[PDB]
Design a protein around this ligand. Sequence first.
Ligand code: HEM
Ligand SMILES: COc1ccccc1O
Length: 402
Amino acid sequence: RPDLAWLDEVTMTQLERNPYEVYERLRAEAPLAFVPVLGSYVASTAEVCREVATSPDFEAVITPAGGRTFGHPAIIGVNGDIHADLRSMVEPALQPAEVDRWIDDLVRPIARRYLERFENDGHAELVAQYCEPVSVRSLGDLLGLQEVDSDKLREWFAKLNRSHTNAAVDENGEFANPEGFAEGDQAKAEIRAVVDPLIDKWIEHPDDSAISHWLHDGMPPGQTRDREYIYPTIYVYLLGAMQEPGHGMASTLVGLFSRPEQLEEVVDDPTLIPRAIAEGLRWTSPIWSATARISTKPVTIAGVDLPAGTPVMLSYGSANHDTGKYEAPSQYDLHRPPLPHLAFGAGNHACAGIYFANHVMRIALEELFEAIPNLERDTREGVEFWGWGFRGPTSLHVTWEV
Ligand code: HEM
Ligand SMILES: COc1ccccc1O
């Protein structure tokens, strides 16, 4: 678009390091805009992202690098009867009444286990030592992957993250970095080696694991869903569902450390943890720009006439800094009004795991502050945030008096 000629000089590295400056310009100049290096239109404001995600004239589409990573039928990329079946498949263990029955007994012992490894050290790097392991161990146990170590689940989500977000396209519209998908293919090959024997077992001997229920629930007697039909949703889980509660926890902690008086309020009154996490997710949204919708008819949005069949990436992390909606959105503020945010998306493809994820993060933070109420951020170490499609802190060094 003519007035956006500067977008041709935006690089993938710039977006990964810090997308907020480019997107601040997009929100003012062009809430719906084609970004050449991403090969796609992007929605940057709250109004546009919410309209696209909820519109009857759009449906889900996987991003280009997302499709190369996950294939079909990834739950994020399908619609109609297949999407309705996949949602019916994943929803039982995520239903709020079901989560409330067992979430505490799942997450709290796991948080205690990881805490005991470091709570008397006086220093820790909380992303690797706590946030990521609690997130992956909780979900891994729910899924039936009790025997897959947390380091391995963390390695898989990192590789899948890099493949899914390997979005850069060249001057011809072709992927600029095709070898960046190789580590995704490698992760998937390893996942298959580990998970295929578990599926073999669950087909004949169902148990209470969620993946066993994905095979069996709603199927006629003696039948299971084909493994090829469920694997792309397994992969979707082994990326975002494993990665995001850890990132959300960690971003919430960074934000609280940036407002020391608010950190103190939350440590003294842990009933404020849920509000702290909601602000954390708005402040640095873990899924920042990983999903998309495609138009099914011509539409006009934010002045742009789009033809049918036009993908639009939903940059919810930008929408969550919309200054039309928020005052000083780049500042973390526990006491912001409880406005809707888009960190779980919207519409029929909104996050299916919200209630689970919010309890994972809550319980992990409750236990952290009970164990180390005098946590302080190691402030000469910097908190680097990284990522355009998924965003979170790369490390979180903390210190405390033992
Ligand atoms: C803080 C943690 C999490 C955040 C911020 C988050 C955010 C999101 C977002 C932004 C999307 C895309 C929504 C859209 O395109 O409108 C999504 C999709 C999804 N999430 Fe979550 N997620 C989190 C954790 C989880 C967990 C732990 C699970 C599973 C237990 C999960 C299951 C799903 C599923 C199944 C979808 C696909 C929904 C669909 O396409 O129908 N999420 N999530
Ligand atoms: C829940 O996991 C995901 C959500 C959106 C995009 C990729 C994912 O793996």
